[PDB]
């Protein structure tokens, strides 16, 4: 029935997302392991992830549906293995750009993971099994983040061994990706709804918030490494990341439980949470104390999770199961276009080339402007 294609997929989602080395990425790269500078990391290497992901989004989206999901999941496993092999052994900036490209391929393939269950599970086990597949990956994420800090601070393991552990995790994640059943059907090819205007409003807010959050998460660790360099101070990235994820999870559940007529309160809550995210980013920027920087991050992630859960609820409440894939694909594509434009303008060496110390001022202003744009038409 719906068990085997759900246990296998959830084990894949768990082991793939349990990567203890992700929290300490910047401390690993800029340390004696790789000798990369902060300026290079922030202005030549990291921007490549946005570009490769943007380029590979749509082709992967079409390929998944034509090829019926599993082979794309297998490709994602292979990309995990290659990315972490390069991250372990690859050296220099020229290889880190390739690493970023392969990680962009990894992220783009996430479509063929979440959508696979729909093609092989009945429709009376769709509603719930979606929750299992989300929760398993989220729990894996938090567990990996907690394990990273536990090991680093109570065992004294260098950041290289965290990457070794992450590679060992993704290798086993790939193994469970060969065992799924091949779907006998698919959504569109083996089987314009935006005409609704309110869906367009919710999609715009979803896309803008996702772009801003994806940029901030991409360039947060560099801020922590500049305010408290790992070379001579205690760094608490794993625990902060775990607590931020747990706060986001509690926020997502709380929004799901509390019953409120979102047709009236959705815009107000979205504005309030955008203002909270702007203020928290400004606090995370200006303050020299590191602990205030962690607290600002935590507040940012929790508020963003509340905002995004409200936005997702409003969009998906009227759409069929079939339209979900296409609608969210277009919404993430617009998000990536926006993210690429802003990355090129701000961070890229072919643009302003701002350092991490001033980037977050721009990001805070961006979130404040997102909040303020929707509030107009107040007299007359």
């Amino acid at each position: 029935s719906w068990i085997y294609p759900t246990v296998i997929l959830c084990l894949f989602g768990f082991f793939s997302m349990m990567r203890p080395s992700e929290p300490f990425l910047i401390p690993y790269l800029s340390g004696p392991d790789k000798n990369l500078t902060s300026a290079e990391i922030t202005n030549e290497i990291f921007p490549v992830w946005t570009y490769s992901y943007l380029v590979l989004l749509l082709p992967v989206f079409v390929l998944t549906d034509y090829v019926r999901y599993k082979p794309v999941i297998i490709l994602q496993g292979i990309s995990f293995i290659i990315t972490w092999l390069l991250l372990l052994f690859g050296q220099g900036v020229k290889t880190m750009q390739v690493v970023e490209f392969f990680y962009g391929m990894v992220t783009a393939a996430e479509v063929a993971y979440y959508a696979y269950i729909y093609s092989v599970v009945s429709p009376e086990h769709y509603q719930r099994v979606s929750g299992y597949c989300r929760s398993v990956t989220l729990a894996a994420y938090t567990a990996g983040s907690v394990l990273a800090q536990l090991l680093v601070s109570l065992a004294n393991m260098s950041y290289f061994y965290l990457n070794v552990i992450s590679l060992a995790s993704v290798s086993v994640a790939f193994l469970f990706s060969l065992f799924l059943p091949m779907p006998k059907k698919s959504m569109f090819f083996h089987a314009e709804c935006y005409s609704s205007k309110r869906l367009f409003y919710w999609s715009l807010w979803w896309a803008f918030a996702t772009a801003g959050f994806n940029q901030v998460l991409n360039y947060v660790q560099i801020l922590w490494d500049y305010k408290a360099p790992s070379q001579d101070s205690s760094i608490y990235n794993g625990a902060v990341e775990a607590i931020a994820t747990f706060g986001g999870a509690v926020a997502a559940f709380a929004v799901g439980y509390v019953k409120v007529n979102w047709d009236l309160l959705g815009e107000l809550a979205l504005v309030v949470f955008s203002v909270v995210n702007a203020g928290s980013l400004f606090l995370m920027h200006y303050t020299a104390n590191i602990w205030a920087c962690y607290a600002g991050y935590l507040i940012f992630k929790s508020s963003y999770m509340l905002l995004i859960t409200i936005a997702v609820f409003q969009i998906a409440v009227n759409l069929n199961v079939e339209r979900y894939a296409l609608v969210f694909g277009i919404n993430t594509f617009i998000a990536l276009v926006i993210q690429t434009i802003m990355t090129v303008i701000v961070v890229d060496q072919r643009g302003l080339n701002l350092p991490v110390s001033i980037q977050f001022l721009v990001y805070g202003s961006y979130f404040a402007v997102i909040a303020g744009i929707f509030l107009m038409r107040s007299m007359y």
Epitope: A39, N43, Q349, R350, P355
Partner: nanobody
């Protein structure tokens, strides 16, 4: 015109260390890049390192990353390049060049820099 002056290059024993210095002059340098390029006989001009004097950002070429280290002596304007563990491949002539910090600057492109110094050999003999 902005006058640049390298100083501190010469013979050095293979595997041992040396420090080059580019005593820039003739203008204010609070908004300037300052990068070192080299030209071994028979090869093209190569990028070696760069420093953004405003934010202090530093870039390095993968052939020297970890071995060389570039720092600014602000009180004197004399940018320095410290070469540690020079290897036989480091024989070259080293130039220090500068460019006004502006939008869309390609740090690693030798055609970006408006001002060049007369150079000074670093004969890394073995």
């Amino acid at each position: 015109q902005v006058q640049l002056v390298e100083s501190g290059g010469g013979l050095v024993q293979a595997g041992d260390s040396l420090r080059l210095s580019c005593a820039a002059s003739g203008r204010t340098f609070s908004n300037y890049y300052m990068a070192w390029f080299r030209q071994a006989p028979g090869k093209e001009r190569e990028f070696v390192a760069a420093i953004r004097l405003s934010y202090g950002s530093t870039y390095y070429a993968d052939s020297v990353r970890g071995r060389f280290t570039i720092s600014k002596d602000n009180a004197k304007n004399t940018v320095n390049l410290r070469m540690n563990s020079l290897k036989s491949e480091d024989t070259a002539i080293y130039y220090c060049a500068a460019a006004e910090d502006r939008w869309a600057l390609a740090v690693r492109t030798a055609t970006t820099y408006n001002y060049w110094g007369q150079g000074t050999q670093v004969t890394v003999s073995s």
